[PDB]
Design a protein around this ligand. Structure first.
Ligand SMILES: [K+]
Lengths: 158, 106
């Protein structure tokens, strides 16, 4: 039922408002009527300090199902980013985002955002999602980091 | 478990506004300070937000403009205290004074 999902989502929003990591943003998107959607969140992940991603505010969208929290949400970067584990559509290929492996219903939205943030600097070579991103990474590593730094400053908050 | 406190309020969905729903009804009558009113539609549609600047543009509009009709179900959750309340909407145009609403209650 959605009742279980919406109750869990209500806990997530209240917990996020009272306490959340600095730089991060997580808020239910605004419906056309002016209201907001608890099953659709607009998120923003800050680049990790000391990394080529530092200085960037990368925006993604969380899509929850009625099966939540039994099923993980669909994390979708808008716009899509240059990253090996990010499909061209913008969808994130992360282990904790699949109910068939390494996904626990007790995982907080915060833990997901913090998980995706680490995936940025530390991509998984095991599951290539993007073609060119996986290519440049396993070849011209110097070129790869230049692409990331240019992308971070491109998505610099202002 | 589980019997959440649930009441019924009679009003005109085409007359009363969201701000009146927020201040006059949920906060003033039902004793809330920072309420988050959600429309029980299985879509997780939240009408009133406790966070300032988010849903301050819906205050002037009427409830009917958000699909709120007779028999609608609203869940008001206070942000500053564990207070959840299920409010049923009994659309009635004949009130008298005319008053804004009435809880039945009472
Ligand atoms: K305003």
């Amino acid at each position: 039922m959605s009742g279980i999902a919406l109750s869990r989502l209500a806990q997530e929003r209240k917990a996020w408002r009272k306490d959340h990591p600095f730089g991060f943003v997580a808020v239910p998107t605004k419906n056309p009527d002016g209201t907001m959607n608890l099953m659709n969140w607009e998120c923003a992940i800050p680049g990790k300090k000391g990394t080529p991603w530092e200085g960037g505010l990368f925006k993604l969208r969380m899509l929850f199902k009625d099966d939540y929290p039994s099923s993980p949400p669909k994390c979708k970067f808008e716009p899509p980013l240059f990253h090996p584990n990010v499909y061209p559509s913008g969808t994130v290929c992360l282990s904790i985002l699949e109910e068939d492996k390494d996904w626990r219903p007790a995982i907080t939205i915060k833990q997901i955002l913090l998980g995706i943030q680490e995936l940025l600097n530390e991509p998984n070579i095991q599951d290539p999602a993007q073609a060119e991103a996986y290519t440049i990474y396993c070849q011209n590593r110097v070129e790869y980091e230049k692409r990331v730094r240019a992308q971070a400053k491109k998505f610099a908050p202002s | 478990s589980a019997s959440k406190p649930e009441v019924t309020v009679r009003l005109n969905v085409h007359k009363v506004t969201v701000l009146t729903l927020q201040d006059k009804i949920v906060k003033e009558k039902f004793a809330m300070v920072a309420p988050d009113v959600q429309i029980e539609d299985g879509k997780g549609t939240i009408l009133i937000s406790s966070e300032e600047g988010e849903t301050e543009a819906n205050n002037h509009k009427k409830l009917s403009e958000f699909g709120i009709r007779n028999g609608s179900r609203l869940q008001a959750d206070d942000f500053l205290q564990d207070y959840t309340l299920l409010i049923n909407i009994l659309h009635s145009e004949d009130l008298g004074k005319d008053v804004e609403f009435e809880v039945v209650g009472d």
